[PDB]
RNA sequence: UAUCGAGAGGU
């Protein structure tokens, strides 16, 4: 009975209409994609040298925000559930960065592309700093001047955005329904005329406006939910939507298990 | 009639004036002309007028208690050291003020 | 001399809010020091709770000595003072 | 050092509001609850509980800091490495951490009256602020813009009982100051309860179920909807009534309304159920004879304290899912009303010209007791203040029911007529020392005017609204009046503070005695019977 | 890092402390999926009459859409209606409102929300620089009463007005305890004849 | 006790992989002063690795 | 201080667009159009780049202290 | 130094550096040395000639 | 300083059950389920699903305090059905709807390739 | 099986105040001096002026905790379009034969005027009102 | 060089103190130097100035926003606020974290606060250019 | 874990 219509698609955003589901299911899917879909992200920074003008934890905070390839992260374990001491090769990716400015002139800009993967759970596709193109330097991290050096060792771990927003695969998620307000779920503020003063939905042409005679259908419920899922590149937009569905399922499955064990 | 300035005794005597109702907003003058029980009522009236002006309301017993303290000695005890500390209260109590 | 006879007592036959708070607290303290309790102790074992149970049954073994301004006094037992 | 002093077992931090705390609770940061302590005597009934606290130690909650022997020797649990090998003896004391439902005295300065110090039940909570139910902000005069408040921990069974049995928040709901409550429904909950109890507010079943479950005292019986067919719908008045205890009757008439209440004003409550009437500040505020006053007299302080929480939990839920806002739009009157406003101010400026003409041609009536110039300034002031009130009334009437400023004014939760007037129509005449702006330059108010100019604009009439914006002259004149307000607040606070101290010292020893008399420390009769009744 | 209790203010005398934080998905959101950094309360506005705060929000919305810093100099020809005209030409309702959705349920809010950028200030007042509690601790040599100040493990002053409050409550035991056991209680010996503290007392 | 003030790594729990210093080791339950945020946490001594001459050694140092 | 990695409000990466934004301004584009070309559609994201101030350029002038 | 009383206090102050705006204001501040004893209001008012 | 570990939102302590069911004896056939380390995400999803069942007579949930990641749900079913069973059915019902939803997205995705 | 029954002609329909409620006044087609003032939900049961409306007042729908109605059971409301349940808060036994019955349907108000013989059964604690057409 | 003092010594700008200000007539803006022909319900009303038939202006304000000092110059639209709110911000603005100097790393001050990511405000005033507020926000 | 002052601030 659930129906899907992909309006547009690309690597980092999918626009789609979702229908024949409950509002609560579309919303719980929205929340799950924002908050609980795992990704990989730097979570421990070993600073061996930092003579830049930036503070150690200033830099560490930016490092955590660098999006890393998280495609195979589902097969990867959480550090808190791994039997090893400290971190290891089965529950983390290790990245290293080393920058320096040689020369008495100019400024060296340190980019996320200088982050070099050193180990990781082979041969899983996880841990590479996301790149737009092949010529893409990525995210600016720091800047160096004569004799200033940056030498760090980073431990990346699997996590979810409930713990820290850096583990979210999304940015915004656009989300709306009932573009003509037939359900009367909002009551518009106006000075002179509400219809002239409020802009049209970008999905106004996807449903038909109410006819001037039409009586109020007090039995209609929301049923068509237009949403666009943007991502940071740690996961592709179709992956976030798919794993969102998967994650919400396991959460319900675990509840069902616990009920069938309380017997 | 209402006046600027007071002379309660002389105005009371003026033929035509209801000598049983003439009032002054100086309760010090009321005490000299009409006595301490009239001063008690006048003191309450003048305080109430202050409180009631900005629409406020204070229960009678609080203002009644204050005006009874100010008149219990038979003269007007100011709410200052010159009134309060002229009491036969202990020295430790009086020196804490 | 100073004591006022039971038949000539004129003060209120109700326990005052101040007498109640002091009686409950004082009795609570005595209970936590293992004073004999005059009611059954079930599940509620805090000293204040036991003291409140004794109060509700008129079983707190204390007397209010109410001083009058002249120094004379009426002794009232908490068994005889009316509790709301 | 003697009438007041610094004390142990005290604490202070920034305050925050919490919609999910009972009226008589205070949320206490964990770190504070681990620093403060209460010395509990060890008995057969608590020795197991208290040994557990001792094992947890001073740094883990619920824990303990000291063990006190009958001799008085304290055992410091920070430095005892064999804390598990401590055996408590009856009669010892354990200085345990502060814990849930411990009574504590809570206080915001300045402590102007007795409900500036009330006893709350501790609730230990994360984060570093003290949490208050919003309905106790009024007696404390507290808000959350940086205010801090103080907490004091009683140290014995006797002083705990004085707090819980005399000073506790619910005992303080009605104050002897004006024989009326000092706490009511405020802010979000008051704004929301008007919106929720509007005659055309309807709630579908699925939301009704959540709202019912949010009332802790709900009896579990879903009431029949006001509309059964074609769709089950409950009204806002029905769900608010869940929060009102049974046996509560209240009647109020607004503007001679009938029992048919066409305007949905007045108030009628029967057996704790709202028959008609928008529920607003006139019903759930702190006024005498309202709902809170009535439940207190009829049900006592415990039920009345739950009333705040019940009302809050239903309304705040409904408002969370309804929404409410305010924007720049709500200050904007339509072009027709602005033209009335601008015309009426223009004609008031003309009347001021006529008054200037009469006074300057010796044709002005002198008021008794007043010089010519006093009479002139008085007539000019009445004209200009009536112009502002008249322009505000036009702006007020033009605002729709949906106008967000109007909704807050109508709930009684924030704002008043003058705020609509000054934001939308006209700020009006600026006063300093009871008079229009004085000629601080020689025969003029600013070097931008000619001498001997008594017009509205010359002596501080601000014609524009805050929406339109003030001119440079108006700006300065408005800042002159505004400075005077800051000066008054800074000065007269010490004037009244000294007054209150002298009042307290005059009266501090005056007590009601067991013979009914009111006497001082000398036994002098001040009143033969308190309040004469 | 900002937390509950820290203080913030716009440039219009409109100040507040953080009451709670909500994650991205619990915030209200617009159809475009924009969520606020910060939600202040409508009751802060009508009695304070800080209309500049509202106008600043409107102009700043326009400015970030069109790519410039709006001119908010006082005493210019700029009007609210002119800024509203620009905003409407950019696809938003002209007075700054937006339809928004409750984060818990996904349902629209019955009310539209004034929404847009406003310049906010991080003030020096942070709760963890103020929080303080004292059980026991150091006293003054001369009075043996607790020392003054957070920075010295001090105790709060129970001043004369707090004394008066406890008198009004009739809490005689509590007031005695505050001012003795919780402060400078001391045992002295006096002579029953002359009443002076001239007694020489060897207790062992 | 011989492990106070000595540097430590945590091998179990929510703080796994984090550096710290033994601030107080009364018995069985230690207090490690984490490096990363300004907080000293309670942790069992079983959860710690101590630094010694050769690498991180469990509580056999 | 230096361009933030993410938009505070929505999380979209903007730390890889600072050089491209300065370049579009050298090429004579107006700020609004440059933001448009960079695909910064939500006004939360536009604020991030439009109002950032690059202070690290000032801090670098202070001759390194090692 | 020997006349620390009767001398005026607060003429020199530690330069406020909390933020850049606060430094600019501190360098442009003025003081009226009237006191705090004797309330009045007249020197505290915003006088017309302050424009 | 008094901030809790963020992992406490979703990691269940070992002595703390994900789920605890008790009766509400004030009405017949009603249970209270306390969910630990869960959100509106789970609670609102279960709630609507359950409310549309014909044999569910009451369903509601509340997050009693936003600073603590738990919620409590109240569920009553008609005499025929047992409340805990209806909850089990809602779980399996929603898991199925999401399986369908995952399939139809996969198909629609290849179609758009 | 009902307590009161009649047909009313709508004389006035006041919207004004609310977007979802209107107050209507009607007079019995069969008996003048029997007047009905009633608040109703615009969106659920839209009425216009001069509409003919059958109004029934019952104390039971039978031919304590509310539940969504089962499709199998059957009640008096199956034959009407719009049903409300309310509280009788005033039974006015006035002079001559001017009798008023005031009912609150969750704040949607009704006053029914008429004679004792037409309204004596309405002296109830609660009333349903059922409206047809 | 031809700068500010060139205007002062060429008779187009002069300095006046409080005493000399007593004897001059100042127009608020250049437009007030000449009489006009409006009725735009959005913009603010200008005083009529109908007490003198003909005004003889001696000077004109350069800009009226220069009556403000450093702190109040940070307020956007102070002409739309109740005047005490402008006083309150003038205090709080001095309590707002930013970047107090660019050399904070080489100063060892008793206390210093630096906002991680300062932004310049979307709503600014002309006077902020001279305060450097957009450069050290 | 000092004392006496001063200055700037918070509600
Ligand atoms: N100098 C002072 N002396 C004594 N008490 C003061 C004080 N300054 C502030 N207070 C206390 O703090 C209160 C001031 O509250 P504010 O937050 O300053 C204004 P308000 O009247 O509550 O709100 P507003 O900002 O909406 O006008 C006083 O009523 C008093 O309780
Ligand atoms: Mg305040
Ligand atoms: Zn591992
Ligand atoms: Zn002697
Ligand atoms: Zn963004």
Q: Which domains does chain J have, with CATH numbers?
A: 1-133 (2.40.50.140)
Closest C-alpha residue for ligand 1 atom 9: D110
Rounded to the nearest angstrom, the minimum Cα separation between A70 and chain D is: 34
* Start-end of H helices in D227-364: 236-243, 281-284, 291-299, 301-322, 335-360
DSSP state of C5: P
Q: Is the CB of E137 under 7 A from strand L?
A: no
Of all helices (H) and strands (E), which one includes residue D194? helix D187-197
C-alpha dihedral (D204, D210, D212, D218), degrees to nearest 10: 160
- Tell me phi and psi for residue H4, to 5 degrees: -65, -35
Resolution (A): 3.0
A171 with A213, same domain? yes
Chain E touches chain K, with at least 3 Cβ pairs below 8 Å, answer: yes
Which pair of structure tokens corresponds to residue D254?
A: 């607004």
Give the orientation angle of helix I83-112 with respect to helix I40-51, to 10 degrees.
Answer: 110
Nearest alpha-carbon partner for J111 in D270, D259, D227: D259
Q: J120 CB contacts (<8 Å, ≥6 apart)?
A: none
Q: Are D12 and D149 in contact (CB under 8 A)?
A: yes
**What gap in Å lies between CA G27 and CA K13, rounded to an integer?**
41
Which pair of structure tokens corresponds to residue F61?
A: 């140092």
Closest C-alpha residue for ligand 1 atom 6: D110
Q: E192 CB contacts (<8 Å, ≥6 apart)?
A: none
Question: What is the number of structural domains in chain I?
Answer: 1
Q: Is the CB of D146 under 7 A from strand L?
A: yes
Q: Are A121 and A69 in contact (CB under 8 A)?
A: no
**DSSP E strand stretches across G1-66:** none
Which pair of structure tokens corresponds to residue A111?
A: 């980019």
In sequence order, the β-bridge partners of residue A35 are: none
Give CB contacts under 8 A, 24+ apart, made by A124-128: A124/A72, A124/A75, A124/A76, A125/A69, A125/A71, A125/A72, A126/A40, A126/A68, A126/A69, A126/A70, A126/A71, A126/A72, A126/A73, A126/A76, A126/A93, A127/A40, A127/A68, A127/A69, A127/A93, A127/A95, A127/A156, A128/A68, A128/A69
Which pair of structure tokens corresponds to residue D106?
A: 């809570």
Q: Is A166 helix (H, G, I), strand (E, B) or coil?
A: helix
Dihedral sign for Cα E40, E42, E46, E51, please: positive
A123 with A228, same domain? no
Nearest alpha-carbon partner for E84 in E129, E116, E112: E116
A198 with A257, same domain? yes
Q: Is the CB of E138 under 7 A from strand L?
A: yes
Domain boundary among A165, A189, A204: A165
**What gap in Å lies between CA A188 and CA A206, rounded to an integer?**
21
CA-to-CA separations, K134 to E66, G25, K98, in angstroms, rounded:
19, 18, 11
Which pair of structure tokens corresponds to residue D465?
A: 């609204």
A119 with A189, same domain? no
DSSP state of D167: I
Residue H28 CB-density burial (10 A; 0-12 exposed, 13-18 middle, 19+ buried):
exposed
D200 touches chain E (CB under 8 A): no
- Tell me phi and psi for residue D193, to 5 degrees: -75, -30
Closest C-alpha residue for ligand 1 atom 25: E48
User: Which of residues 71-110 of D have CB within 7 Å of strand L?
Assistant: 109-110
**What gap in Å lies between CA D424 and CA D396, rounded to an integer?**
9
**What gap in Å lies between CA A173 and CA A15, rounded to an integer?**
10
A43 with A62, same domain? yes
Q: Are A177 and A30 in contact (CB under 8 A)?
A: no
Dihedral sign for Cα D421, D427, D433, D438, please: negative
G32 touches chain E (CB under 8 A): yes
Q: Is C23 helix (H, G, I), strand (E, B) or coil?
A: helix
What is the residue-wise DSSP string for D46-112? THHHHHHHHHH-TTSSS-EEEEE-TT--EEETTS-TTGGG--PPTT-EEEEEP-TT-EEEEE-SS--
Nearest alpha-carbon partner for D400 in A192, C24, F39, I12: A192
Q: Are J65 and D220 in contact (CB under 8 A)?
A: yes
**What gap in Å lies between CA D312 and CA D290, rounded to an integer?**
17
**What gap in Å lies between CA E114 and CA D328, rounded to an integer?**
8
Residue E141's nearest nucleotide, by CA–C1', is: L2
Upstream peptide bond of D110 is cis (omega within 30 degrees of 0): yes
> Looking at the domain C1-84, which fold is it?
Eukaryotic RPB6 RNA polymerase subunit (3.90.940)
Which ligand does the CA of D492 lie closest to?
1
Q: Are E108 and E99 in contact (CB under 8 A)?
A: yes
DSSP-based helix, strand, coil % in chain G, nearest 5 = 45, 5, 50
Question: How far apart, in Å, do the first and last CA atoms of chain K sit?
Answer: 32
**What gap in Å lies between CA D324 and CA A130, rounded to an integer?**
41
Nearest alpha-carbon partner for G46 in A179, D68, E62: E62
**What gap in Å lies between CA I2 and CA D125, rounded to an integer?**
9
Look at domain D187-322 and name its CATH class: mainly alpha
Residue E152's nearest nucleotide, by CA–C1', is: L1
CA-to-CA separations, F13 to A164, F8, F44, in angstroms, rounded:
18, 14, 10
Q: Are D14 and E5 in contact (CB under 8 A)?
A: yes
Q: Are D178 and D264 in contact (CB under 8 A)?
A: no
What is the residue-wise DSSP string for K59-91? EE-S-GGGGS-TTGGGSSSGGGB-HHHHHHHHH
What is the residue-wise DSSP string for B14-74? STTS-TTT---S-HHHHHHHH-HHHHHHHHHHHHHHHHHHTT----HHHHHHHHHHHHTTS
Q: K134 and G53: CB-CB below 8 Å?
A: yes
Which ligand does the CA of E44 lie closest to?
1
Nearest alpha-carbon partner for J130 in J74, J53, J65, J67: J53
D25-D27-D33 Cα angle (round to 5):
120
**What gap in Å lies between CA D507 and CA D505, rounded to an integer?**
5
Nearest alpha-carbon partner for C26 in G12, D157, E45: D157
Give residues after which chain F gaps, C-N over 2.5 angstroms: none
Residue A62 CB-density burial (10 A; 0-12 exposed, 13-18 middle, 19+ buried):
buried
Q: Are D244 and D269 in contact (CB under 8 A)?
A: yes
Which pair of structure tokens corresponds to residue J18?
A: 């609310």
A259 touches chain D (CB under 8 A): no
**What gap in Å lies between CA D486 and CA D490, rounded to an integer?**
6
Ligand 1 closest atom vs CA D108: 31
Q: Choose the mutation target among A188, A216, A219, A220 for the interface with J, i.e. most J CBs under 10 Å.
A: A216
> Domain map of chain C by residue range?
1-84
Q: D513 and C24: CB-CB below 8 Å?
A: no
**What gap in Å lies between CA J109 and CA I26, rounded to an integer?**
33
Q: Helix (H) and strand (E) counts for chain G?
A: 4, 0
Q: On the CB side of E146, how many CA atoms lie within 13 Å of its CA?
A: 30
A20 with A48, same domain? no
A157 with A76, same domain? yes
Nearest CA in chain E to K84: E13
CB pairs below 8 Å between F and I: how many? 4
**What gap in Å lies between CA E168 and CA C18, rounded to an integer?**
12
Residues of D whose CB is below 8 A from F39:
none
**What gap in Å lies between CA K90 and CA A103, rounded to an integer?**
47
- The CATH number of residue I101's host domain is 3.30.1360.10
Q: Is C25 helix (H, G, I), strand (E, B) or coil?
A: helix
The β-bridge relationship of strands E100-101 and D518-519 is: unpaired
Which pair of structure tokens corresponds to residue K43?
A: 């913009």
Q: Are E102 and D332 in contact (CB under 8 A)?
A: no
Nearest alpha-carbon partner for I55 in D197, E95, J67: J67
Which pair of structure tokens corresponds to residue K108?
A: 């060892």
Q: What distance in angstroms lies between residue D301's CA and the mean position of ligand 1's atoms?
A: 29
Contact residues, K window 16-55, toward G, CB-based 8 Å cutoff: none
Ligand 1 closest atom vs CA D490: 1
Which pair of structure tokens corresponds to residue K30?
A: 């250049």
Binding pocket residue ranges, ligand 1, CB within 6 Å: D 110, 141, 143, 145, 493; E 47-48
Upstream peptide bond of D62 is cis (omega within 30 degrees of 0): yes
Which pair of structure tokens corresponds to residue I41?
A: 């995400």
The β-bridge relationship of strands A149-159 and D117-125 is: unpaired
In sequence order, the β-bridge partners of residue J36 are: J26, J112
Q: Are A227 and A175 in contact (CB under 8 A)?
A: yes
Nearest alpha-carbon partner for E50 in K89, B7, C46: K89
Rounded to the nearest angstrom, the minimum Cα separation between A213 and chain G is: 37
Nearest alpha-carbon partner for H18 in E151, D148, K131, K92: K92
Q: Are A158 and A91 in contact (CB under 8 A)?
A: yes
The β-bridge relationship of strands D37-41 and D148-152 is: unpaired
Question: What is the number of structural domains in chain A?
Answer: 2
In sequence order, the β-bridge partners of residue J22 are: J40
DSSP state of D154: -
Of all helices (H) and strands (E), which one includes residue J52? strand J52-58
**What gap in Å lies between CA I54 and CA D407, rounded to an integer?**
40
- Tell me phi and psi for residue C56, to 5 degrees: -65, -25
SS3 annotation, J55-114: EEEECCCCCCCCCCCCCCCCCHHHHCCEEEEEEEEEEEECCCCCEEEEEEECCEEEEEEE
C-alpha dihedral (D64, D68, D69, D71), degrees to nearest 10: 170
Q: Choose the mutation target among J18, J19, J21, J43 for the interface with A, i.e. most A CBs under 10 Å.
A: J43
Which pair of structure tokens corresponds to residue H6?
A: 């009767």
**What gap in Å lies between CA J128 and CA J126, rounded to an integer?**
7
B interface with D, Cβ–Cβ < 8 A, is 4, 57-62, 64-66, 68-69, 72, 77, 79-80, 83-84, 87-90, 93, 96-97
Which ligand does the CA of G9 lie closest to?
5
Greatest CA separation found in chain E?
A: 97
Q: Is the CB of D4 under 7 A from strand L?
A: no
Which pair of structure tokens corresponds to residue D506?
A: 């005059």
Chain I touches chain G, with at least 3 Cβ pairs below 8 Å, answer: no
A124 with A172, same domain? no
> Looking at the domain G1-66, which fold is it?
Arc Repressor Mutant, subunit A (1.10.10)
In sequence order, the β-bridge partners of residue A143 are: A109
Greatest CA separation found in chain K?
A: 65
Q: Residue K49, by phi and psi: left (phi above 0), alpha (psi -120 to 50) or beta?
A: left
Experimental method: X-ray
Nearest alpha-carbon partner for B7 in B31, B24, B20, B21: B24
Upstream peptide bond of D230 is cis (omega within 30 degrees of 0): yes
The β-bridge relationship of strands A13-19 and A3-9 is: antiparallel
Nearest alpha-carbon partner for F56 in A86, D222, J5: A86
A132 with A220, same domain? no
Neighbours of ion ligand 2 (CB under 5 A): D 143, 145, 147
Nearest alpha-carbon partner for D152 in E169, E162, E184: E162
Which nucleotides of strand L lie within 7 A of protein CB? 1-3, 6-11
Q: What distance in angstroms lies between residue D467's CA and the mean position of ligand 3's atoms?
A: 63
CA-to-CA separations, K97 to A61, G51, K119, in angstroms, rounded:
20, 17, 12
Structural domain for A105, as ranges: 39-165
Q: K119 and G55: CB-CB below 8 Å?
A: no
Give the orientation angle of helix A23-35 with respect to helix I83-112, to 10 degrees.
Answer: 70
Question: How far apart, in Å, do the first and last CA atoms of chain B sit?
Answer: 44
CA-to-CA separations, C51 to C23, C29, C57, in angstroms, rounded:
9, 9, 10
Residue G14 CB-density burial (10 A; 0-12 exposed, 13-18 middle, 19+ buried):
buried
Q: D447 and H44: CB-CB below 8 Å?
A: no
Residues of J whose CB is below 8 A from I78:
67
Domain boundary among A165, A186, A219: A165
**What gap in Å lies between CA D104 and CA E133, rounded to an integer?**
13
**What gap in Å lies between CA G18 and CA A140, rounded to an integer?**
8
């Amino acid at each position: 009975e659930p129906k899907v219509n992909i309006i547009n698609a690309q690597d980092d955003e999918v626009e789609l209409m979702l229908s024949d589901v409950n509002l609560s299911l579309a919303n719980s899917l929205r929340r799950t994609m924002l908050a609980e879909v795992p990704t990989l992200a730097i979570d421990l920074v070993e600073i061996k040298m930092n003579t830049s003008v930036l503070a150690d934890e200033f830099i560490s905070h930016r490092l955590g925000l660098i999006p890393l390839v998280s495609e195979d992260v589902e097969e990867m374990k959480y550090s808190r559930d791994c039997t090893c001491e400290d971190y290891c090769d089965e529950c983390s990716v290790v990245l290293e960065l080393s920058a320096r400015h040689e020369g008495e002139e100019g400024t060296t800009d340190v980019y996320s592309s200088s982050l070099i993967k050193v180990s990781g759970p082979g041969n899983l596709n996880v841990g590479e700093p996301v790149r737009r193109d092949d010529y893409d330097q990525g995210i600016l991290l720091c800047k160096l001047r004569n004799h200033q050096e940056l030498n760090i060792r980073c431990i990346a771990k699997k996590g979810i955005a409930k713990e820290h927003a850096k583990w979210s695969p999304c940015s915004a998620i656009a989300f709306e329904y009932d573009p003509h307000n037939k359900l009367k779920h909002t009551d518009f503020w106006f000075e002179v005329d509400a219809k002239k003063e409020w802009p049209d939905s970008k999905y106004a042409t996807w449903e038909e406006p109410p006819k001037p005679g039409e009586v109020f259908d007090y039995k209609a419920k929301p049923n068509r939910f237009y949403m666009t899922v943007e991502t940071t590149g740690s996961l592709k937009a179709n992956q976030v939507f798919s794993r969102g569905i998967k994650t919400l399922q396991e959460k319900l499955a675990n509840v069902l298990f616990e009920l069938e064990n309380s017997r | 009639l209402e006046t600027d300035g007071i002379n309660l005794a002389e105005v009371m005597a003026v033929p035509g004036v209801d000598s049983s109702r003439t009032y002054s907003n100086s309760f010090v003058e009321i005490l000299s002309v009409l006595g301490i029980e009239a001063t008690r009522s006048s003191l309450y009236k003048e305080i109430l007028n202050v409180i009631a002006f900005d629409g406020s309301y204070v229960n009678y017993r609080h203002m009644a208690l204050l005006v009874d303290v100010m008149t219990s000695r038979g003269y007007l005890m100011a709410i200052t050291r010159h009134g309060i500390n002229r009491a036969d209260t202990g020295a430790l109590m009086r020196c804490s003020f | 001399e100073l004591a006022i006879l039971k038949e000539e007592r004129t003060t209120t036959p109700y326990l005052t809010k101040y007498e109640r708070a002091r009686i409950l607290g004082t009795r609570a303290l005595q209970i936590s020091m293992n004073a004999p309790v005059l009611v059954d102790i079930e599940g509620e074992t805090d000293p204040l709770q036991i003291a409140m149970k004794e109060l509700s049954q008129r079983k707190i073994p204390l007397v209010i000595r109410r001083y009058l301004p002249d120094g004379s006094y009426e002794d009232w037992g908490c068994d005889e003072l009316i509790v709301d | 050092n003697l009438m007041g002093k610094r004390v142990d077992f005290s604490a202070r931090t920034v305050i925050s509001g919490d919609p999910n705390l009972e009226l008589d609770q205070v949320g206490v940061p964990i770190s504070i609850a681990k620093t403060l302590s209460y010395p509990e005597t060890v008995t057969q009934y608590n020795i197991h509980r208290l040994t557990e606290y001792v094992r947890n130690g001073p740094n883990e909650h619920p824990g303990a800091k000291y063990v006190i022997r009958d001799n008085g020797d304290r055992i410091d649990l920070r430095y005892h490495k064999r804390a598990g090998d401590i055996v408590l003896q009856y009669g010892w004391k354990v200085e345990r951490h502060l814990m849930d439902d411990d009574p504590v005295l809570f206080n915001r300065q300045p402590s102007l009256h007795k409900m500036s110090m009330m006893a709350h039940r501790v609730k230990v909570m994360p984060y570093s602020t003290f949490r208050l139910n919003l309905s106790v902000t009024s007696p404390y005069n507290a808000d959350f813009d940086g205010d801090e408040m103080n907490l004091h921990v009683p140290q014995s069974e006797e002083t705990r009982a004085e707090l819980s049995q005399l000073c506790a928040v619910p005992l303080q709901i009605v104050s002897p100051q004006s024989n009326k409550p000092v706490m009511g429904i405020v802010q979000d909950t008051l704004c929301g309860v008007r919106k929720m109890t509007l005659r055309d507010t309807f709630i579908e079943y699925e939301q009704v179920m959540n709202m019912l479950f949010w009332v802790p005292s709900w009896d579990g019986v879903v009431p029949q909807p006001a509309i059964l067919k074609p769709k089950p719908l409950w009204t806002g008045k029905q769900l608010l009534s869940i929060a009102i205890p049974s046996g509560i009757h209240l009647q109020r008439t607004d503007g001679g309304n009938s029992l048919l209440s066409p305007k949905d004003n007045g108030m009628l409550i029967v057996d704790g159920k709202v028959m008609f009437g928008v529920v607003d500040k006139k019903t759930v505020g702190s006024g005498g004879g309202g709902l809170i006053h009535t439940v207190m007299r009829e049900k006592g302080p415990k039920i009345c304290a739950e009333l705040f929480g019940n009302i809050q939990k239903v309304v705040n839920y409904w408002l969370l899912h309804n929404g409410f806002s305010i924007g720049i739009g709500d200050a904007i009157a339509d072009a027709s009303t602005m033209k009335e406003i601008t015309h009426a101010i223009s004609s008031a400026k003309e009347q001021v010209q006529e008054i200037i003409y009469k006074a300057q041609h010796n044709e002005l009536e002198l008021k008794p007791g007043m010089t010519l110039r006093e009479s002139f300034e008085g007539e000019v002031s009445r004209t200009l203040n009536d112009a502002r009130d008249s322009a505000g009334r036009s702006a007020e009437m033009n605002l729709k029911d949906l106008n967000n400023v109007k909704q807050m004014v109508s709930a009684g939760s924030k704002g008043s007529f003058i705020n609509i007037a000054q934001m939308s129509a006209c700020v009006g005449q600026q006063m300093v020392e009871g008079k229009r702006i004085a000629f601080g330059f020689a025969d003029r108010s600013l070097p931008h005017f000619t001498k001997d100019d008594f017009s509205p604009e010359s002596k501080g009439f601000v014609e524009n609204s805050y929406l339109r914006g003030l001119t440079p002259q108006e700006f300065f004149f408005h800042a002159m009046a505004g400075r005077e307000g800051l000066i008054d607040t800074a000065v007269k606070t010490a004037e009244t503070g000294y007054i209150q101290r002298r009042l307290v010292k005059a009266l501090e020893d005056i007590m009601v005695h067991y013979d009914g008399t009111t006497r001082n420390s000398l036994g002098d009769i001040i009143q033969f019977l308190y309040g004469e009744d | 890092v900002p937390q509950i209790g820290d203080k913030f203010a716009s440039r219009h005398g409109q100040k507040g402390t953080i009451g709670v934080t909500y994650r991205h998905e619990d915030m209200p959101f617009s159809a475009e999926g924009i969520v606020p950094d910060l939600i202040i309360n409508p009751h802060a506005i009508p009695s304070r009459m800080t209309v500049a705060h509202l106008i600043e929000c409107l102009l700043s919305k326009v400015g970030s859409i069109r790519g410039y810093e709006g001119d908010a100099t006082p005493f210019t020809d700029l009007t609210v209606d002119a800024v509203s005209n620009l905003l409407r030409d950019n696809g938003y309702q002209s007075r700054g409102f937006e339809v928004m959705y409750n984060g818990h349920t996904g349902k629209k809010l019955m009310a539209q929300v004034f929404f847009g950028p406003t310049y906010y200030q991080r003030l020096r007042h942070m709760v963890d620089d103020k929080i303080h509690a004292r059980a026991r601790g150091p006293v003054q040599v001369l009075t043996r009463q607790p020392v003054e100040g957070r920075s010295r493990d001090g105790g709060l002053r129970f001043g004369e007005m707090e004394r008066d409050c406890m008198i009004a409550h009739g809490a005689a035991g509590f007031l005695k305890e505050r001012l003795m056991e919780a402060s400078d209680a001391f045992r002295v010996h006096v002579c029953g004849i002359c009443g002076l503290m001239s007694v020489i007392a060897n207790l062992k | 006790d011989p492990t106070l003030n000595k540097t430590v790594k945590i091998r179990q729990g929510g703080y796994k992989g984090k550096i710290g210093i033994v601030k107080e080791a009364n018995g069985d339950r230690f207090r490690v002063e984490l490096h990363n945020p300004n907080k000293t946490i309670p942790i069992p001594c079983s959860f710690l690795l101590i630094e010694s001459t050769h690498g991180w050694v469990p509580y056999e140092d | 201080m230096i361009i933030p990695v993410r938009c505070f409000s929505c999380g979209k990466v903007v730390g890889d667009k600072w050089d491209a934004y300065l370049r579009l301004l050298e090429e004579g584009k107006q700020e609004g159009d440059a933001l448009d070309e960079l695909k910064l559609k939500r006004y939360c994201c536009r604020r991030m780049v439009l109002t950032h101030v690059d202070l690290i350029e000032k801090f670098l002038r202070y001759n390194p202290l090692e | 130094q020997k006349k620390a009383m009767s001398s005026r206090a607060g003429v020199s102050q530690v330069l406020n550096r909390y933020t850049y705006s606060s430094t600019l204001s501190h360098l442009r501040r003025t003081n009226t040395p009237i006191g705090r004893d004797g309330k009045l209001a007249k020197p505290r008012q915003l006088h017309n000639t302050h424009w | 300083m008094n901030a809790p570990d963020r992992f406490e939102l979703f990691i269940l302590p070992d002595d703390v059950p994900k789920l605890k069911i008790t009766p509400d004896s004030r009405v017949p056939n009603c249970i209270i389920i306390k969910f630990e380390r869960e959100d509106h995400t789970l609670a609102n999803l279960l709630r609507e699903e359950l409310a549309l069942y014909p044999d569910v007579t009451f369903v509601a949930y509340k997050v009693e305090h936003p600073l603590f990641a738990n919620f409590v749900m109240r569920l009553q079913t008609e005499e025929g059905t047992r409340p805990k069973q209806a909850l089990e059915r809602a779980c399996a019902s929603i898991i199925n709807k999401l399986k369908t939803l995952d399939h139809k997205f996969n198909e629609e995705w290849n179609i758009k390739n | 099986s009902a307590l009161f029954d009649d047909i009313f002609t709508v004389q006035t329909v006041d919207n004004g105040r609310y977007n979802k409620v209107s107050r209507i006044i009607g007079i019995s087609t069969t008996n003048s001096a029997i007047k009905l003032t009633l608040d109703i939900n615009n969106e659920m049961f839209p009425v216009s002026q001069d509409d003919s409306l059958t109004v029934t007042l019952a104390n039971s729908l039978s031919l304590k905790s509310w539940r969504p109605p089962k499709p199998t059971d059957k009640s008096l409301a199956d034959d009407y379009d719009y049903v409300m349940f309310g509280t009788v808060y005033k039974f006015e036994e006035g002079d001559e034969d001017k009798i008023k019955v005031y009912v609150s349907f969750g704040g949607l108000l009704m006053c029914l005027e008429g004679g004792y013989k037409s309204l004596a059964s309405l002296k109830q604690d609660n009333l349903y009102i059922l409206i047809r057409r | 060089v031809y700068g500010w003092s060139s205007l002062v010594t060429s008779g187009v700008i002069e300095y006046v103190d409080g005493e000399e200000e007593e004897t001059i007539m100042i127009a608020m803006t250049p437009e007030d130097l000449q009489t006009r022909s409006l009725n735009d319900t959005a913009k603010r009303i200008k005083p009529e100035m109908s007490t003198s038939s003909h005004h003889t202006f001696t000077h004109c304000e350069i800009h009226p926003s220069m009556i403000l000092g450093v702190a109040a110059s940070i307020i956007p639209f102070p002409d739309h606020n109740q005047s005490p709110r402008n006083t309150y911000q003038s205090a709080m603005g001095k309590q707002a974290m930013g970047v107090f100097l660019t050399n904070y790393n080489v100063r060892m001050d008793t206390m210093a606060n630096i906002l991680y990511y300062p932004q310049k405000p979307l709503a600014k005033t002309q006077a902020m250019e001279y305060l450097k507020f957009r450069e050290l926000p």
